[model samples]
Target: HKLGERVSRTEMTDVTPAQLGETKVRVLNASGRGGQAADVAGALKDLGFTQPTAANDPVYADTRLDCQGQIRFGTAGQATAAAVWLVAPCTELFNDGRADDSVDLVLGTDFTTLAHNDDIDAVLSSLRPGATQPPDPTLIAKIHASSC
Candidate 1:
């Protein structure tokens, strides 16, 4: 079934148990606004991810490139501990001070599939139990520079 783009399927081969200890997966998307990025991050959180990093920045409308971001996960033992990112619409014009529109989420390695889908309610259902923190400036700066 086509979700957003074609859900291309591929598997990492010859991955060893030792390799799994520190395995890091980098997921990227270049698409409409920044919704996919947020969905992925929120899913990571639901999967029990602790720290995932995302970078979201606006691009010039004239530019052919899509608004882009990153989600980085650090690992320890059988589980990932922390996740963080530089989420955007950093500008008030885009986000309107609502966390809902931001595409940045830092989730642990255990996030869920339901959280990662394009549906907003599915993602919100997986939010971590805490007050939303202020935006990270370092990540925001990186997001701004990421667009070509």
Candidate 2:
């Protein structure tokens, strides 16, 4: 699917461990903070994902990603984006049209941490115990309050 494509929550759950391992991921920190992207990338690396890379996002501040962050992907990355959102939710989805199936995880200032792998499995198995909750509600509230 292309940008603005709406993927249902059930559709987002159709990911497997092998698929996740094959999914290419890139972490882009737009939070204006240091070490966050790298740390989050490392966490993903530990979870059976192949070598994921981290870098600074150049266009996040100019984009509409004012939430926790965004899970950016392409038409070929439906399942890959699902796996990414399983690990990191509360972020917006940006389906940037591209030929590859790579998923870009952009970190905004509201990004706190990746979900625990234990919870991840529950979500993958259809347990759905707050799997999509934002990592930091206090921080999210602060951002909302400040914006108002």
* Candidate with maximal TM-score: 2
Report the Cα lDDT for candidate 2: 0.66
| Residue-level error in angstroms, candidate 1, position 63 | 6.7
lDDT of 1 by residue, 1-148 (tens): 1112211111101111111122232223334344554676455544544423444323322332322322222122111111222122111111122222122222222322221222322222233344263323333333334422
Question: TM-scores for all candidates?
Answer: 0.27, 0.69
**Please, what's the RMSD in Å of model 2?**
8.6
lDDT at position 139, candidate 1: 36
- The C-alpha stretches of model 2 lying farther than 4 A from their native spots are 1-18, 61-65, 117-119, 122-148
Lowest-sum lDDT 10-residue window in model 1: 7-16
- Backbone clash pairs for candidate 2 read none
Tally clashes: model 2.
0
Candidate topping lDDT: 2
